[PDB]
Structure 1
């Protein structure tokens, strides 16, 4: 069911057959200093470490910082021959395909894919902005959003890393931001727009107010347009020309462009001096740690079998199926918190949603920022207990027998299980290293494993050649077409990363219909952040909508950027645009604490290499570091895993055993461990000049749309002693009935005397309590009269405390405010009669029971609503009178609502939803917290009908920490 696409092949430039072992560090520096390819590789990747090695080979590098130079150069040597991961001059990227026969020779030719350093370039533009503000034009930053009397940003940039800044919302800010919304405006024009409405005596205030907006990036200049996204040398230069009077930047910049173009055509290794020039010009313009990005691409075309294509598709099936056991996630708990605050009939503006005071904050696992209210970790189920038992069992088995762990043992388990079988998972990208064992070619999953972000790995390389652009577009096309059918608008989120040294990773080509910019600007169609609303669909899944066009959105970060470094809102928009199930393989979660893990395999694929944990506390004194790793049986060759980089180490190499001793005592300082993996021969499969290359691959594998805008607090919240009085009476479940029987009647009478009405509700959340809501002329007079009764209920220990709370009306849920009022009329009339049914159920001398009264009043409800019908009643019933008493009141109120519903052409769908509620809140009053027995009373009721058929220039700037 998973179909493997053509794939990226990444392989190293040097060949590991030319690697040589070293025994002395000084010895390394010389072989390296005579290695032409290596020296250019280092000058490009890491200019500052490069200059330090020059300072070495010219006598005076201060001899305290010599070892660090050593350790670094050795690791860079290792990284240059081993380790296939794409990065400037070290290794190259190419397209692979499937055919009827394998092909591993690289016949094609190598290109340089050159980019400015994004951190350099951004720093430059900010230099120019400060110089030429009055000659530029500025637009509004989409990151801005008004909240109350303040103007926030989703995140802050110009900071020195600690502070988040917000300003006050003033007339001046309004004029300026409205004037620059979806528009650029020369500095001068902005200034006048405010003076043409304030006076010319205020020109000076304007110039600095505007000055402040540009400094704290509430306004971005025309220079930042397409700077990151679809950068052009020519449009960049044109823009700079017009503003650069003294030719201070334009002349040096063209030399840089010229040299880069010259550098482009040079071979790899015989280009060090041309590169030296390139830094020199750029260094003079502005120093940065790095100046140039390079992505090596290539003409080659590696081929895989048909046995290989199935083998990979088999693995994609298996990995996908394990998700079937993800029952409950952090987003699910988030979804639940959403449903309790907002109804199920509300779309909420996303900045409001994520506010921890006016909304509900973020998911438990989110960190930017983490919630500041207290919360305990939500229950999450990522695999079943039965499954966890099998996994631990397979583990102790494999350890005891000194064997591999065979994951395929559970393949049937995952395929035969489907339950609700929707196939939520839409596609994968796996990351596989190529290697050998016992002279046989094998796949090895990286620690990376992969993810469900199609296009993720290719997005960076897409713009480097039309064959790549074509490749990207095809991978992306799966999701894009499935979006076309469901009439969903896609958006790339395009942003200036908070941490500016992460800028080079943001990069990708926009393949989506629109764009969400942050601290930047593009030519694509852009969504405003404050137009984004979040709702929940009929099957209870999050969705985003642009309220201004009513379109539905899915958002994309089509890159290898860490998806957890985003502000909460951005992370959310991403995550609801995928399936929430891939990410937590069971074996990773279950085996993580063990200090030895067997190799994990699946159908001859190595799922994970064997892993070791080595602890500081174990090197002892009569137990050497070498003797220790032999005691735990680490092989001659192995990796140490720092993060997402591993370094090759050999037990037989003296330098390497040093590296190990260094690593083990830095973790020692921290009461920590160090991670080892076993090694695979990975040097002789992909070849070029009859020499092997280290290689990895990345294989991609492939209705009531209503919903009301959330109504404002001012219209929806009914404050104490306005129209309503709302009390939370804390009463234990065992005693609520007695309160309703023997206390409520008195209360109802008091409120009757004042010609008002009341309805109540039963709740469990916080602690058990009854929610009283009273509508009446003199509310405070009513409170005082109630209070005596409450005092008695406290005295008898029926009720502990109470609160007087704001009544938050469920407007959206019950139609308009109009339909709401009549619903409330039903609530009261229903409340009015409940003590009577309860008296009645309680009575022994005859009848009834509870569940009879339940079934009977739902029926009375349905008859009333649908006018003694049955075809109307049954069609409603398939998705889910005679006694006088006070039912005259209830029937009457049900009547008025049915009439007003019909009077305003409520759709059938709206009417059912509203009706279900009225029945639901009745069930709440009559009997307790009811769950799915709601649908059983509905299920039971089918049968019965079946059988019948001036200082606003202030900018009060504030900063917070973290």
Structure 2
């Protein structure tokens, strides 16, 4: 069902058949320092490091800096030959296709895709924003958001540091910000708008206050419009020129554009001095540790077999199938927290949602910021207990037998599972390394593996050529067409990273309808952060909606930017926008702590290479590092895995053994371990001058929303002793019924004399208690009078404590404050009858017991709401003992119901609004009469279904 798209092919420039071996570190500096290609590769990728090498060769480098210089150069050398991952001048990106025969050979021609370093560029514009503010115009940073008397940002920048900063919401912030909320406004008019309702006396302060917003990036200048998303030398230069009267910046900038254009046609090896010129003209303007990024594209076209295509599609299905066993994620627990705080009827402003003092904070696994109240880890279930026994069983036998682990064993388990549920997953990107074993070509799955973010691996390369833009457009038009069916507005999050070093990762082309920007601005239609509201589907699924247009939103980050790095709210918007189950493969999770893991394989694919964990503590005086790794039967060629990258080593090469001894002694310092992986021969598959290249590939594969905007706390919260008084009475479950018999009616009698009315509820969490809510006109006097009854229940050890709490009304659930109040009259009437029903259930002269009263009362409710019309009653029911009727309390309840029923008719409530509200009112009756119990509430409806049919 998964179809393998045309893929990206990534390969080295240099060829590993030309790799030289080495025995000494000085020998490596000697060779490398007259290797024309290497030094251009080094000067471009790692300027600072390249200069340290110069410094050493000149004798100017301090001794303590030398081991690091030696190791970094050796590792960078290995990499320019052995590591195909695409990065400027080491390796190149091309497009590959599926045909009838494999074509592992590159006829194409290599070209340099060249951007400015993005940290350099932004750091310049920020310098222009302060120097030239009086000649610029400004807009509001979408990152800003009001919160009480403060203005916050979803993240912070200028303090070149790591600390968050917020400002006061002043009258002057209000004027300035609302004035710039939708367009750009000239410095002078911003200043004018302030003085025009303060006085010209204040023009000093206005300018200062305005400048301080600009330093702290509460405002964005027009130099930043499209500056990170679609940069144009024309548009940029003409605004700088318009700004720069003393020609300080234009001309060097024109020279830089020239020198880069000249650099574009030079070969790889020959441009060292042209590059030196670029760095020189750019370092004069403003210094930065990097000045240029290059992505090398080719126009070659690698081909794969029809069998190969089938092998990959087979692998995609197996991997996607395992997500079938992900029953409860960290985000599911968050959905539950959501529903407990908000119910299902509210939509919540996203910045209110994630507030840990006023909302529910974040998913347990979010760290920006981590929750600042304590909470223990929730239950998750990413695989079953049966699955885990199989995996451990598979693990134990493979180690006992010196075998690999064939995941094939469970392929028929996972494809079989849940053939009923319609799989959510739209597609996959997979990352694969090409190698060989026993002269046969094999695929090896990257340790990154892949993801379900379609177009993520190609978005960076989209703009660099038309063929690439076409490619990317195809990949994401399978998502955009489906968004269009479902009437969902897609939306790219476009942002300056919080740590601006990472600013070159964020690049992609905007293929969506709208844009959500932060610390930048574009020309697209843009969503306001504080217009995003979160709710819950008919299927208890998180969705996002723009409160100004009522559009439903899905958000995208079509790049390889680490998603766990974001501010919680942005990470959340991203995560609710795809299908939350791909991610945690069971073998990764279950085998994680073993220090030897066999190779994992699946249908000739190497899912995961053999993996070791070597421990610092094990290198002993009776044991060096080389018989340690020999005591663990480490192959003669292996990788040491650092993080992002890995370093090739051989036991035969003594330099490789020095790097390892270095590695092992660093970890003996922290008292942890290093990670070794087995080596695959990977050099002579793809080729060029019939010389191999190291290669890898990236294959892609292919309602009636009600809900109401949440009501403010000012309107929903009822404060103690104003209109209501609300007590939590901490009474055990076994004694609540006794309290409801022998104490509550003395409390009801009291509040009656004072002309009021009360309703109660049973609630656990934290500990079990009864929520007593009294509405009455002299509440301090009613508190006084019932305090005697409560003391009596403390003495008899039925209640331990009480609190007086804020009554948070459920306005949205019960239909607005009008139908809410009528619901509350139903609550209080239901509460008057309960002690009498309990006394009938308790008396044995009766021989009616608790389940008889429950179906009966439930029967009378339905007879009230639908006015004895049995056919309507069964309408409601399909979709989910005479003296109580002549009881005076029940007559009062029956009026309370007629009155709610009338107002719902008056205000034209859609009918499912009425069905949900009657379900709620019957739900809290059951709470009151019997347990806080799940589903035994629901099976009452089933038997009432039977009794009503019989009336006919």
TM-score (norm 2): 0.99
Q: For residue 482 of structure 1, report the CA deviation from its aligned partner.
A: 1.2
Q: For residue 786 of structure 1, report the CA deviation from its aligned partner.
A: 0.7
Q: For residue 419 of structure 1, report the CA deviation from its aligned partner.
A: 7.0
Distance in 2 of aligned mates of 1:732 and 1:236: 71
Distance in 2 of aligned mates of 1:870 and 1:553: 42
Q: Is the 8 A contact 1:155 1:567 kept in 2?
A: yes
Distance in 2 of aligned mates of 1:428 and 1:940: 48
Counterpart of 1:956 in structure 2 is: none
Counterpart of 2:335 in structure 1 is: 335
Secondary structure in structure 1 of the residue aligned to 2:813? helix
Distance in 2 of aligned mates of 1:419 and 1:49: 55
Distance in 2 of aligned mates of 1:156 and 1:558: 23
Q: For residue 838 of structure 1, report the CA deviation from its aligned partner.
A: 1.0
Q: Is the 8 A contact 2:488 2:553 kept in 1?
A: yes
Which deviates the most, 940-949 or 319-328? 940-949
Q: Is the 8 A contact 1:480 1:490 kept in 2?
A: yes
Q: Deviations over 1:64-96 (max 9, x none)?
A: 422222111110111000011000010011111
Q: Is the 8 A contact 1:754 1:777 kept in 2?
A: yes
Distance in 1 of aligned mates of 2:16 and 2:851: 79
Q: Deviations over 1:465-487 (max 9, x none)?
A: 11111111111111111111111
Secondary structure in structure 2 of the residue aligned to 1:812? coil
Counterpart of 2:695 in structure 1 is: 695
Secondary structure in structure 2 of the residue aligned to 1:543? strand
Q: For residue 420 of structure 1, report the CA deviation from its aligned partner.
A: 5.6
Distance in 2 of aligned mates of 1:856 and 1:101: 76
Q: For residue 422 of structure 1, report the CA deviation from its aligned partner.
A: 2.7
Q: Deviations over 1:755-812 (max 9, x none)?
A: 2111110111100000011111211111111110000101011011000000000000
Aligned: 1:931 with 2:934: yes
Distance in 1 of aligned mates of 2:412 and 2:844: 57
Q: Deviations over 1:288-332 (max 9, x none)?
A: 100000000110111111111111111111111111111111111
Secondary structure in structure 1 of the residue aligned to 2:523? coil
Distance in 2 of aligned mates of 1:946 and 1:118: 72
Distance in 2 of aligned mates of 1:703 and 1:522: 32
Q: For residue 882 of structure 1, report the CA deviation from its aligned partner.
A: 4.8
Q: Deviations over 1:532-563 (max 9, x none)?
A: 11111111011111000000111111110010
**Correspondence 1:616-695 to 2 at 5 A:** 616-695=616-695
Q: For residue 890 of structure 1, report the CA deviation from its aligned partner.
A: 1.2
Secondary structure in structure 1 of the residue aligned to 2:698? strand
Q: For residue 943 of structure 1, report the CA deviation from its aligned partner.
A: 2.0
Secondary structure in structure 1 of the residue aligned to 2:627? helix
Q: For residue 919 of structure 1, report the CA deviation from its aligned partner.
A: 0.7
Counterpart of 1:906 in structure 2 is: 909
Q: Deviations over 1:178-224 (max 9, x none)?
A: 11111111111110111111111111011101011111111111111
Distance in 1 of aligned mates of 2:562 and 2:950: 61
Q: Is the 8 A contact 1:488 1:552 kept in 2?
A: yes
Secondary structure in structure 2 of the residue aligned to 1:621? coil
Q: Is the 8 A contact 2:15 2:81 kept in 1?
A: yes
Q: For residue 31 of structure 1, report the CA deviation from its aligned partner.
A: 2.2
Structure 1 residues 882 and 419, CA gap change in structure 2 (3 angstroms): farther
Which deviates the most, 334-343 or 933-942? 933-942
Q: Is the 8 A contact 1:637 1:650 kept in 2?
A: yes
Secondary structure in structure 2 of the residue aligned to 1:509? coil
Secondary structure in structure 2 of the residue aligned to 1:290? coil
Counterpart of 1:945 in structure 2 is: 948
Q: Is the 8 A contact 2:428 2:451 kept in 1?
A: yes
Structure 1 residues 420 and 352, CA gap change in structure 2 (3 angstroms): farther
Counterpart of 1:882 in structure 2 is: 885
Q: Give unpaired runs (5+ residues) of structure 2.
A: none
Q: Is the 8 A contact 1:145 1:151 kept in 2?
A: yes
Task: Kindly report structure 1 stretches of 4+ aligned residues shifted beyond 6 Å.
Answer: none
Which deviates the most, 33-42 or 149-158? 33-42
Distance in 1 of aligned mates of 2:617 and 2:14: 39
Q: Is the 8 A contact 2:436 2:682 kept in 1?
A: yes
Distance in 2 of aligned mates of 1:772 and 1:75: 70
Distance in 2 of aligned mates of 1:334 and 1:163: 27
Q: For residue 432 of structure 1, report the CA deviation from its aligned partner.
A: 0.7
Q: For residue 933 of structure 1, report the CA deviation from its aligned partner.
A: 1.8
Q: For residue 578 of structure 1, report the CA deviation from its aligned partner.
A: 1.1
Q: Deviations over 1:332-380 (max 9, x none)?
A: 1111111111121000111111111111111111111111111111111
Q: Is the 8 A contact 2:130 2:211 kept in 1?
A: no
Q: Is the 8 A contact 2:885 2:891 kept in 1?
A: no
Distance in 2 of aligned mates of 1:160 and 1:940: 67
Counterpart of 2:776 in structure 1 is: 776
Distance in 2 of aligned mates of 1:137 and 1:895: 61
Secondary structure in structure 2 of the residue aligned to 1:857? helix
Distance in 1 of aligned mates of 2:4 and 2:862: 54
Distance in 2 of aligned mates of 1:388 and 1:843: 53
Pairs aligned (count):
949
Distance in 2 of aligned mates of 1:871 and 1:270: 88
Q: For residue 425 of structure 1, report the CA deviation from its aligned partner.
A: 2.0
Q: Is the 8 A contact 1:725 1:774 kept in 2?
A: yes
Q: For residue 856 of structure 1, report the CA deviation from its aligned partner.
A: 1.6
Distance in 1 of aligned mates of 2:100 and 2:947: 65
Q: For residue 387 of structure 1, report the CA deviation from its aligned partner.
A: 0.9
Q: Is the 8 A contact 2:321 2:414 kept in 1?
A: yes
Distance in 2 of aligned mates of 1:420 and 1:786: 57
Q: Deviations over 1:617-646 (max 9, x none)?
A: 111012110100010011010000000200
Q: Is the 8 A contact 1:704 1:909 kept in 2?
A: no
Q: Deviations over 1:394-453 (max 9, x none)?
A: 000000001001111111111221176131222111111111111111111111011111
Distance in 1 of aligned mates of 2:504 and 2:697: 22
Counterpart of 1:186 in structure 2 is: 186
Secondary structure in structure 1 of the residue aligned to 2:251? helix
Q: Is the 8 A contact 2:98 2:306 kept in 1?
A: yes
Q: For residue 875 of structure 1, report the CA deviation from its aligned partner.
A: 2.2
Structure 1 residues 419 and 910, CA gap change in structure 2 (3 angstroms): farther
Q: For residue 753 of structure 1, report the CA deviation from its aligned partner.
A: 1.3
Q: For residue 49 of structure 1, report the CA deviation from its aligned partner.
A: 1.1
Structure 1 residues 753 and 83, CA gap change in structure 2 (3 angstroms): same
Q: Is the 8 A contact 2:398 2:405 kept in 1?
A: yes
Q: Deviations over 1:1-23 (max 9, x none)?
A: 21111111111110011111111
Distance in 1 of aligned mates of 2:339 and 2:106: 56
Q: Is the 8 A contact 2:538 2:705 kept in 1?
A: no
Secondary structure in structure 1 of the residue aligned to 2:132? helix
Secondary structure in structure 2 of the residue aligned to 1:692? coil
Q: For residue 667 of structure 1, report the CA deviation from its aligned partner.
A: 1.0
Distance in 1 of aligned mates of 2:419 and 2:848: 40
Secondary structure in structure 1 of the residue aligned to 2:759? strand
TM-score (norm 1): 0.98
Distance in 2 of aligned mates of 1:941 and 1:584: 45
Q: For residue 883 of structure 1, report the CA deviation from its aligned partner.
A: 4.4
Distance in 2 of aligned mates of 1:354 and 1:53: 48
Q: Is the 8 A contact 1:831 1:925 kept in 2?
A: yes
Q: Is the 8 A contact 1:5 1:702 kept in 2?
A: yes
Distance in 2 of aligned mates of 1:393 and 1:851: 49
Secondary structure in structure 1 of the residue aligned to 2:937? helix
Distance in 1 of aligned mates of 2:64 and 2:859: 88
Q: How big is the alpha-carbon RMSD for the aligned residues of Structure 1 and Structure 2?
A: 1.1
